[PDB]
Design a binder for this molecule. Sequence first.
Ligand code: ADN
Ligand code: ADN
Ligand code: ADN
Ligand code: ADN
Ligand code: ADN
Ligand code: ADN
Ligand code: CL
Ligand code: CL
Ligand code: CL
Ligand code: CL
Ligand code: CL
Ligand code: CL
Lengths: 239, 239, 239, 239, 239, 239
Amino acid sequence: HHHMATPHNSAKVGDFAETVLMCGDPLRAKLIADNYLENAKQVNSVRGMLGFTGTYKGKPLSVMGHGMGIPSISIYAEELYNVYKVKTIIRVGTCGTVDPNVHVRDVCIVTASGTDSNVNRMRLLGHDFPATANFEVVSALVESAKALNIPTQVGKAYSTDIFYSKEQGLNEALAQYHFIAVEMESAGLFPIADYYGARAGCICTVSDHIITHESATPEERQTSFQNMIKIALEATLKL
Amino acid sequence: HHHMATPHNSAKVGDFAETVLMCGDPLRAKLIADNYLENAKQVNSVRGMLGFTGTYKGKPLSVMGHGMGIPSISIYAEELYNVYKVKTIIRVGTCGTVDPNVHVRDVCIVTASGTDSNVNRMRLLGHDFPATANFEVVSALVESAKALNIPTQVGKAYSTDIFYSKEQGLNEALAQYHFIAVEMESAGLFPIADYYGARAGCICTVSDHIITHESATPEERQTSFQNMIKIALEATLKL
Amino acid sequence: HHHMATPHNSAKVGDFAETVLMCGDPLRAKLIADNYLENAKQVNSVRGMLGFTGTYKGKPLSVMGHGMGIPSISIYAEELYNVYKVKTIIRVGTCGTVDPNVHVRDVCIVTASGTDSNVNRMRLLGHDFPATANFEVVSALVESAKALNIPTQVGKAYSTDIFYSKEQGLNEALAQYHFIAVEMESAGLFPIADYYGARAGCICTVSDHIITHESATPEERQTSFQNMIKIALEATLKL
Amino acid sequence: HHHMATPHNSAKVGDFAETVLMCGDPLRAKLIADNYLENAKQVNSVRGMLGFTGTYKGKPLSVMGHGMGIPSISIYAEELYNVYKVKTIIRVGTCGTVDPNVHVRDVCIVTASGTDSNVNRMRLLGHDFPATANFEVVSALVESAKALNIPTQVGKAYSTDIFYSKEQGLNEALAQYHFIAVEMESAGLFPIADYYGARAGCICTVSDHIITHESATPEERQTSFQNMIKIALEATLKL
Amino acid sequence: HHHMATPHNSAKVGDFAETVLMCGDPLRAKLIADNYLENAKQVNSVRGMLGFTGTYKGKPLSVMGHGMGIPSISIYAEELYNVYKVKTIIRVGTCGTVDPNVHVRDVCIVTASGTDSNVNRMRLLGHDFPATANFEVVSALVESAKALNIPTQVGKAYSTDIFYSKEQGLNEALAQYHFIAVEMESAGLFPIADYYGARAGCICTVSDHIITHESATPEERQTSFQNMIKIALEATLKL
Amino acid sequence: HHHMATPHNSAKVGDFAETVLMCGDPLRAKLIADNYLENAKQVNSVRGMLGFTGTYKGKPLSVMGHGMGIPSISIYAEELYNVYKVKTIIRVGTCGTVDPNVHVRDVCIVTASGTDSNVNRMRLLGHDFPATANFEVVSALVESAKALNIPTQVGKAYSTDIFYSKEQGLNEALAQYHFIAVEMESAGLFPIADYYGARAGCICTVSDHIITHESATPEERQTSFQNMIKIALEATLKL
Ligand SMILES: Nc1ncnc2c1ncn2[C@@H]1O[C@H](CO)[C@@H](O)[C@H]1O
Ligand SMILES: Nc1ncnc2c1ncn2[C@@H]1O[C@H](CO)[C@@H](O)[C@H]1O
Ligand SMILES: Nc1ncnc2c1ncn2[C@@H]1O[C@H](CO)[C@@H](O)[C@H]1O
Ligand SMILES: Nc1ncnc2c1ncn2[C@@H]1O[C@H](CO)[C@@H](O)[C@H]1O
Ligand SMILES: Nc1ncnc2c1ncn2[C@@H]1O[C@H](CO)[C@@H](O)[C@H]1O
Ligand SMILES: Nc1ncnc2c1ncn2[C@@H]1O[C@H](CO)[C@@H](O)[C@H]1O
Ligand SMILES: [Cl-]
Ligand SMILES: [Cl-]
Ligand SMILES: [Cl-]
Ligand SMILES: [Cl-]
Ligand SMILES: [Cl-]
Ligand SMILES: [Cl-]
């Protein structure tokens, strides 16, 4: 038995750096820690949601899984900003796309995310609350990719509660308004950062084209991940 | 590299029994498999969402984690009913309560679950779709608890997208209408079972009283879990 | 002029038994009283909404009409639970079906009911509140039918505000999720029972198949009614 | 057994006049027929919802009950306009008021009615559809009252699904915007008339002041009814 | 620099008559003042939203532009009723029609207006609040047109936020329920008049048939305007 | 009579530059043209909504008024992107603030805007569609202000339909989530730019603090405008 600072995290207060990368898959958090962090230690194991704290090029940085969907990321991110006093979270993830000019393996930097969730209406008296990335975070990601000579798409994501969509007309509307990424979490992250006066952003790589059916192979997903994670890590040095 | 029957599950088709217990914590799925299943093998490890298949008293039974929140359980349960041809899922979990006559450590058998999610409105043209447990599953749980001489509360749950509620008046309304359990998943499970012509139910133990602040100790949670899991396992023999 | 305990009911306080059967048609309430109750007297005549109190096999039991639609049943049931101190109401009625495996003359026992009404959103801060039958009532109906060797369908109803639907896609969605009964009242009854800490359920017979156009003849409806009413009356002895 | 032109009305096609008065209480429909119609016959008895056809000052006129709430009036009025080819319906009823300048026993002529029902959103793609009385009907009622030297209030009603309101702030908002009548049916009637290219209106007498608690005695309600019904009957001669 | 009684109006308190005509185009307000008012002076120039006060046949009358859309008219009308103590506003405007029996150049007198705006839900606890014209204003317009031997259509308008509609099925629904006018402002005006215990109405001429594509020429629009404005001006003498 | 390329704009096709500044007040559009454009000509006068085309530092640039509210800007911007083939619109405006760390006279660069309008739900199947500024436009504004040594706040706006708010709790929620600007138009502009594959942004100066009641004097508003307009004009050179 270990003391629980939250119901979902065994990390002691202070065990997270002020900057955190989060991905849905805890096993990918372990890969990031093992391959890009120094001075690294595991700080959470509860529910298998592995989290780690170390340094990247000398600067404190943590990485942790967030699970799948808005309710899951909301738990972990609320706790990080509130209990662990985190200042900046960058979600690093994968996505689909419907946009005719976005392609599998593209890196997408998210400026804002729509959603079919109610969580943001509940925060703003039932109205439209845009889940919006912090501009300094977006800019740090854009500038890092430029320095690395990695092309990026910059624009809106759509965070759905329903991976297995049965919704006629959704993809056509997303394409009409040039949503570049379809995922399940960023729309929950950004308003929590707002609540705490903190910062958040998101960068994702396109695994699948929802319209054309193109799909990245395992090796292509690894290469896309290597590009995206390097962009995110370099961006943390400016944040 | 192993073949992926779904993006979230490495189990081969046929590797799940027709009856599955699901809990949010994959580490608890491992505990259930290790302590109550025979002939057991691990069938999924993707994203750390451990799943296992074996037998309970000779009858095929699987157990797998579902993560936290409606979007997460919806992925895993949709795949189980669709790809893995599962017929019955019983969610085994923990919950809070606001009801003045429900107490920490009580076992709650869920007949239906409300929610603040939009996922069920999207299935029924925007209207009210009650997430309803299958009657044979509810009855099997009730009868199993009676045979084990374990008291149970039977009634409505509320599945929220937001663990860290800031919503004035919610607890008072839940208490006024005698919702017995507050959790985050059952309202997503029951309509998916309906879609596939299959069966689902839920049983949970009260970890915390949201109004009085009472909270079960670690040992009390283990004892509550032992009672609940025995009820669920015995119920599978009738399903 | 007689004293009015409510605006809609001339019955004196105490004139209703603790258990009440309700049907939409007051003339059917009279038929039930005349043919199944002993010690019977008429206790309400206001607005022609006939109600009666007597005994069934020695146990106090009332029967009263509720009119058509959620607003009408809500008036009468609110008054019965509040002013008349009723503990259990079973709605006995007729319904349509869209389910491919439910047939005209089938008896349907309702576990929960969806709706296109707003009345339940208004009770739960705008969220999804499942109108859910009390489990002891459902079980009493199921067990009574078993003892009488009368087959039953057990599952969800849909209570609509609009008998003359013009809504494209509604029947297809109801069938997809295996709603077994289409009626106009149960979704209003169950939450009122919850408010008063009381019990409610519903049993109905299929008069019409909405998809195939099959329709029960007058004699077939009488036979279906005889089966359903015997199930309900026998269930009251266990409640 | 008699032939049923609708499920809810035994009247033969042609048995209703082109102009119909409707009130919620079928016993009040009988009173109107017995005391104001000549050449009168009963044309419906189904569900006790008495309806009658005769003449008023030589002009064909019917009167029938509509029950309580939007779903109930919608059934009866849809059938009258569709199957029975009715051209004009005037609802004659009772109401409460919250307006500080409207008093018990006042006669209210309704120009439009708000509602907490969804039935009108479902007709207009989810938008705001005002349930609006036909201007010729409103004018006929206003002019008839003037000729009879009976004062009237003219303005908005609010048709609620919930007689037993628990809704904080509703009465204050209704008063702020000068809603003059609170009832349960007119918002369902007016859009059905629109659908059929037909005409509808409503006139009501104030039985109760919801804010001040004033309430009309039985004799006062009879006098108010006599004034209102004379206005409505005289208006039919101009319609 | 001049003193600003509101942020949007340089008129001094008292500079508006108690009766005001409003049209969307400020240049049309100038035309009305120049051609129909005596004793006229310009009282507002802010944002180019020209307004004027004078007399029509000796009776004080003002005319001012309101801009396009509900938010714009709401600003100007709120200020007129609140700060300038106006008692009656008649909107004079142009509209489209979808109704099969309404034709280009027809004069439409509005009894109530639907909308796709949220502004009226926000006033009535989320419910349906009909934007309803004052009956004395409607009657004054109807009677004035009769005296001038100018035919009129009397009925519902629809005030949309979106001139360039992309909404499948909207026109068909508007036609089904006999909405006679499509415009962008009246649904915002009527509830503001209600709030202040004041009066409002609307009269419009059909510029375009949305279904048949017929369109009035410039000269035809001038003739339609001459008919409509004479009706409105004569109506002010009765208000 | 002049030919009308749209119902609201007399400009000939080609008469607008590919880059346009828009402000609500047409008289302010004239001031911008008169004081910052060369080669300038007036291209629209319809409804007094003055628009002009010229050059800024040699680069083609137009400026036009947009009126007040989402419906008004939607008309003008839809036409500019569609008929006039405009590629970039920057809204230049004024706003209020509720944020405790934003002050009167501050320049706010908008990354996204929330709203109480329905126009964006209607574009995305009823879901949350974030009205999001184009990143290149935001960056051009940020970089221009940096080069001019003018401090800026960068973050979310809220576009309301209701200038005269009566909404309890709105300001507290806006402050809790650090909305920096309250205005009435940007949430309508950004999705129209998306539809056309074009670009939009917004920059505003704080005229009033809604919480503290501080208010900029006329001279202070002129100085704030001079700073903001110089930022916007310099940004057009990079777009
Ligand atoms: N097409 C997609 N739809 C939804 N989520 C996706 C998609 N592609 C990748 N994801 C991401 O991966 C998970 C689902 O496999 C989610 O957590 C989500 O963020
Ligand atoms: N009070 C609670 N509120 C929400 N979820 C709860 C609560 N107590 C236990 N849970 C369950 O445990 C997880 C949150 O800790 C969720 O998956 C949920 O099912
Ligand atoms: N197909 C149906 N749709 C709605 N209500 C029905 C249907 N069949 C029977 N009913 C019941 O009978 C009445 C309508 O005839 C309602 O009170 C309802 O409960
Ligand atoms: N205060 C009230 N609230 C709702 N309905 C009322 C009220 N007063 C009278 N009525 C009318 O009478 C019935 C309720 O008693 C309804 O049919 C309704 O039309
Ligand atoms: N078809 C139409 N749709 C919307 N508004 C219209 C229409 N025809 C005329 N209008 C009116 O003119 C303006 C739009 O050109 C709006 O202010 C509105 O009141
Ligand atoms: N506090 C405010 N609320 C709303 N709009 C504002 C505010 N301050 C400035 N504006 C802007 O000025 C106009 C209202 O005066 C609107 O067009 C809007 O963009
Ligand atoms: Cl991941
Ligand atoms: Cl668990
Ligand atoms: Cl019945
Ligand atoms: Cl009545
Ligand atoms: Cl105009
Ligand atoms: Cl401006």
